[PDB]
Design a protein around this ligand. Structure first.
Ligand code: ADP
Ligand code: ADP
Lengths: 300, 281
């Protein structure tokens, strides 16, 4: 059983010729509205892969709030710990170009009101893995890890979007999951390139600031893992339509792989499979693949 | 009055990929080049009508009642089965914008009644509606006996037919280049607008040039947000000519509105009132 603690966002999406550079006005088409948020996406990702999942976070007392909560319940995620909030739900401004590269700006809304006291112990009882991200306040992330350990869950921190982390969080996490910008933020010096070797060396560096399994995602180059092994796990070759929610599929698939009892080798392959499929359909949450697609792609 | 025919938009800590500016603002205000130009005239104490399409969504209502509360006649604003700008802004006033035309793409020639043009002194147009509707709006303006002000913005190619049918052709340095060829590195901007040519070429903090042959200096101000500077200038110029001011005093009156727009954040909210622009005289 997995608990996901994190954000619920309404995604407002535009197809664009080209992502605007600073100062640029670009013309877009095909305006669309879908439930999203790193938290809600990772919960739904676990559900479509057939894992049992609860979601703990806040929606606002607006139309979107109901749509965010109902969306989750419909996918069969347990929404008993989704709390109603004065003011607006989270909203996200997404642009996607023809290569599937995106640009996202998030208005936190009710996600900013998820405080430590909002975390009851019964949401964590009997869960094997707690899955956290950073579209909620850092004091809430600390409490979630604490309550997670107290219940005997593995703490999976997806440190995204990019944010500075205090030692208290980095030291209390079983697995730290970051993309290259998050890895560079926390380490200083980017991998302005890949060799898969370069981000292994940075994932070894991030390893120094804790005692977790460290996982670094590389988009079209897959992922690396510094922990009980130092290894690269290649991407599945697919046609990428919209890269939105691919880290969410991957995070959610890693969580459920470890929940179900898979080792890291298997769970990371499973996760690259799921993150690859998410690139091949448009939109965030709607692109989240189902167990049988993911298993098809693994079987080859 | 002045008739404005063009766009209405609602203008609305980031996954970077491709990259966003490090800055945290957006929320909700009426915008679009048409709406902004109309509100500009209204805030400058001018009688003004807005002609264009909103959607059947909450925004559509908000845009309409928004323009109304500023003092714009919205009678001719047609509901449609809204245009949206996703605006990201950093603390240094730098912007990234993604526009979804919505209803604005559905404003077709047969949408323009001649009633709306009757008695008006200036028809003010931009290029945020289909080109065939701009053509219609010009033709109906000429019929009603109005001066047709084309603001050829945003940057787009135009045929000789359209260029030859307007009484004033308002452009910036990128649009000037688009229609002619080769950016004015300045004057050379005045020799480019004569290659165009009444043609008005805006130059930011260097003000505006004219030839039908003169340059009108910028009002020096603290530029925090250059958004809606073109809209305030366009709206103000349109109001100076409909008020019967000379071209020289109107272009000074445009620069003065233009400069005051730069001094406050956002688009429609930064548009100066009359008392403000008259003080800067
Ligand atoms: N073009 C791609 N081809 C194959 N897999 C991809 C592609 N883009 C992303 N992925 C998968 O999704 C995961 C997340 O990619 P990445 O861009 O690092 O995440 P995020 O969207 O959080 O930045 C990768 O590890 C990989 O499994
Ligand atoms: N920094 C500035 N200082 C003074 N006046 C300015 C400044 N920026 C713009 N303006 C005024 O507002 C207008 C700005 O239009 P401009 O920046 O040339 O093109 P755009 O249509 O892209 O906004 C007029 O050109 C000018 O009078």
């Amino acid at each position: 059983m997995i608990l996901v603690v994190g954000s619920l966002n309404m995604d407002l999406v535009l197809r664009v010729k080209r992502l605007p550079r600073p100062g640029e006005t670009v013309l877009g088409e095909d305006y669309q509205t879908h439930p999203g948020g790193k938290g809600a996406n990772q919960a739904v990702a676990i559900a479509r892969l057939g894992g049992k999942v609860r979601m703990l976070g806040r929606v606002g007392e607006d139309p979107f709030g109901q749509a965010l909560k109902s969306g989750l319940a419909q996918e069969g995620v347990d929404v008993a710990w989704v709390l109603e909030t004065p003011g607006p739900s989270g909203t996200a401004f997404i642009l996607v170009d023809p290569e599937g590269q995106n640009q996202i700006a998030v208005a936190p809304g009710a996600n900013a009101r998820l405080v430590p006291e909002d975390l009851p112990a019964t949401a964590f009882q009997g869960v094997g893995v707690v899955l956290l991200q950073l579209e909620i306040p850092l004091e809430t992330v600390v409490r979630a890890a604490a309550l997670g350990r107290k219940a005997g869950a593995r703490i999976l921190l997806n440190a995204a979007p990019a944010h500075a982390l205090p030692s208290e969080i980095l030291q209390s996490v079983d697995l730290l999951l970051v993309n290259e910008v998050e890895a560079a933020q926390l380490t200083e010096a980017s991998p302005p390139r890949t060799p898969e070797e370069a981000l292994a060396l940075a994932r070894q560096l991030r390893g120094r600031a804790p005692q977790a399994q460290v996982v670094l995602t590389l988009g079209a180059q897959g992922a690396v893992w510094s922990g009980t092994e130092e290894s690269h796990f290649p991407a599945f070759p697919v046609r990428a339509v919209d890269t939105t929610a691919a880290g969410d599929a991957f995070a959610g698939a890693l969580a459920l792989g470890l929940a179900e009892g898979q080792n890291m080798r298997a769970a990371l392959r499973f996760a690259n499979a799921a993150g690859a499929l998410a690139t091949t359909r448009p939109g965030a949450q709607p692109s989240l693949p189902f167990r049988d697609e993911v298993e098809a792609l693994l079987f080859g």
